[PDB]
């Protein structure tokens, strides 16, 4: 089930941001399914080698998740990062320094 990088079917990062930000603003507490979908999206960018968008998504989520400051969002972001780190190492052995 290989797709081009899409989130809820949104490939365009603009539309993705619209989704992420709406999610993080309207939803006070992320559901594991949503979190895993963000996970699968980040890893999807890795496989499709579009680290450009990946970098942008990561930083964008940082902005939103940490502006909401709550541990559920903070841990969520870190959790996603872990996936990205490990998967990048599996694939290219080259990770992105997320700070």
């Amino acid at each position: 089930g290989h797709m081009a990088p899409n989130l809820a079917g949104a490939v365009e990062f603009n539309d993705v941001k619209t989704l992420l930000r709406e999610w993080i603003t309207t939803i006070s507490d992320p559901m594991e399914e949503d979190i895993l979908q963000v996970v699968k999206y980040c890893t999807d960018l890795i496989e499709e080698k579009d680290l450009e968008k990946l970098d942008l998504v990561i930083k964008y989520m940082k902005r939103l998740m940490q502006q909401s400051v709550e541990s559920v969002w903070n841990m969520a972001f870190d959790f996603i990062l872990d996936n990205v780190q490990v998967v990048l190492q599996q694939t290219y052995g080259s990770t992105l320094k997320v700070t």
Partner: peptide, 17 residues
């Protein structure tokens, strides 16, 4: 119910494209 509690599930479902 009809849609899940997942935001993205909802979004994927509402996009009947």
């Amino acid at each position: 119910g009809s849609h899940k509690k997942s935001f993205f599930d909802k979004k994927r479902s509402e996009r009947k494209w």
